[PDB]
């Protein structure tokens, strides 16, 4: 991601994409019996595992220390889930596609105490992406930027090592900027359209941070720390090579 | 802000800048007696009044309906305060310059229940701006983008009027993007440096939304709605022309 071309970055990314998962519940039994938050919570958890594997495939992420990988993910996991949710609901107006067998509208979100507010923001985002006609090439770049950027300023202290982490990370963010502009340039936008489209895309990133923050406010609006779980997943051995 | 040049936009903005205010407390009496949150709260409130007048001077803001002006400000007021705080603390390492007679460090932030966490994030932001060597021309563009962008996706419904609001607003955001790139171009960056610097600046915008959200979480971690106060200030007469 520095001597890797833009079409090189883009290709790794499109390839690193996590799989789409199904909601688990018997489609032969009624819906009134299926806790939605249970449904949504078990899904989110199943997706997280897959998200760690993705993150190790994002250029420059694994050249980071283990602590710094845990921290970035701890800061960004919900943003990354939500932009994924948003992206896959793009061609599904008024609906959130949580899973292929779980397509929900805002009226269904009213079932959970204070959840419709969140649903309305996600749908609004999906509508913007659709209005912008966001492309897969673009979307995977956006996701990588969220991973790299959201915790980068919460690397409190600054040993020599941590300072190098930050340098490395902004470097990678810069090459991802380079990759987004090239995608736009290949697509035939003009110079002006390029930078205008870059700004529209990054500003959406502020709206996804907001939903994540509102989301953690809800998620806690109610076992083992998340660091520990994360760290346990990221600190893998190499015995299963 | 569409047939207004970039040097035209920049000039209005630098001119619309609010004044810097002092903290009110007798400098002849000790500090142990001065409630910091009282100090900080009365300051924030005094700044808000000034912020409304600024916002009416930001290109395109007043062509918006009154409701939409109230909403944008209600969504962004704390982000706008904080980036201002951050900017003026730039050349004051390890310190937050709340007022000229109120320069504080993180140890002083420990005095308030859970406030040091916020102080650490603001200082971190000020350090990034200093590391980026953010310019006043740039900073005023950033602030205008925060005003215009933070609520733009929380314009729930979509009457014909609201849709036009949104069109107008993204248009204004686009010309502000154009203004930032031109400032950079005049400054002699390269094409690549331009877009890389654009991205670094907008991504900081996500970190300021995060601090605002954590900030409202603290601010409420404890009279007349804020809409109403805002609306009362924005819905001025023209009798004092
Ligand atoms: C939009 C969210 C969502 C999902 C499921 C999949 C998905 O991709 C999602 F993005 O369900 C909710 C969901 C997401 C995350 C959850 O986290 C559960 C805790 N678990 C997360 C990973 C580490 C282990 C802890 C639970 C529900 C939802 C949500 C989030 C916040 C909120 O206030 C209301 C609904
Ligand atoms: C960083 C903040 C700040 C200030 C003062 C001036 C300033 O420019 C600031 F940015 O003090 C705190 C401050 C800011 C806003 C406040 O709001 C008070 C309510 N008032 C705001 C405007 C409408 C009327 C309600 C109070 C304290 C602080 C803060 C914010 C959040 C937090 O969790 C801890 C400290």
Swiss-Prot record, chains A, B:
It is found in: Nucleus; Golgi apparatus; Cell membrane. Residues 5-237 form the NR LBD domain. Residues 1-241 are annotated as: Interaction with AKAP13. The modification Phosphotyrosine is found at residue 227. It comes from the Eukaryota. Residues 1-241 are annotated as: Self-association. 17beta-estradiol binds at residues 47, 88, 218. A lipid is attached at residue 141 (S-palmitoyl cysteine). Changing residue 80 to C: Loss of transmembrane localization, no effect on peripheral membrane localization. Impairs activation of estrogen-induced activation of NOS3 and production of nitric oxide. No effect on binding to ERES. Selective estrogen receptor modulators (SERMs), such as tamoxifen, raloxifene, toremifene, lasofoxifene, clomifene, femarelle and ormeloxifene, have tissue selective agonistic and antagonistic effects on the estrogen receptor (ER). They interfere with the ER association with coactivators or corepressors, mainly involving the AF-2 domain. Composed of three domains: a modulating N-terminal domain, a DNA-binding domain and a C-terminal ligand-binding domain. The modulating domain, also known as A/B or AF-1 domain has a ligand-independent transactivation function. The C-terminus contains a ligand-dependent transactivation domain, also known as E/F or AF-2 domain which overlaps with the ligand binding domain. AF-1 and AF-2 activate transcription independently and synergistically and act in a promoter- and cell-specific manner. AF-1 seems to provide the major transactivation function in differentiated cells. This is Estrogen receptor. It comes from Homo sapiens (Human). The lineage of its organism: Eukaryota, Metazoa, Chordata, Craniata, Vertebrata. The gene is ESR1.
């Amino acid at each position: 991601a520095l001597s890797l071309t833009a079409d090189q970055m883009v290709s790794a990314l499109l390839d690193a994409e996590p799989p789409i998962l199904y909601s688990e519940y018997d489609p032969t039994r009624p819906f009134s019996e299926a806790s939605m938050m249970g449904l949504l919570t078990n899904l989110a958890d199943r997706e997280l595992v897959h998200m760690i594997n993705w993150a190790k495939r994002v250029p420059g992420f694994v050249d980071l220390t283990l602590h710094d990988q845990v921290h970035l993910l701890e800061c960004a996991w919900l943003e990354i889930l939500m932009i994924g949710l948003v992206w896959r609901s793009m061609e599904h107006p008024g609906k959130l596609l949580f899973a292929p067998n779980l397509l929900l509208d805002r009226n269904q979100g009213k079932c959970v105490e204070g959840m419709v507010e969140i649903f309305d923001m996600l749908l609004a985002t999906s509508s913007r992406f659709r209005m912008m006609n966001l492309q897969g090439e673009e979307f995977v770049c956006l996701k990588s930027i969220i991973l790299l950027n959201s915790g980068v300023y919460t690397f409190l202290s600054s040993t020599l090592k941590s300072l190098e982490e930050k340098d490395h990370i902004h470097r990678v963010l810069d090459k991802i900027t380079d990759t987004l502009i090239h995608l736009m340039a290949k697509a035939g936008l003009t110079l002006q359209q390029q930078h205008q489209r870059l700004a529209q895309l990054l500003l959406i990133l502020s709206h996804i941070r907001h939903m994540s923050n509102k989301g953690m406010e809800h998620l806690y609006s109610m076992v083992v720390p998340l660091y520990d779980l994360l760290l346990e997943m990221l600190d893998a051995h190499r015995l299963h090579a």
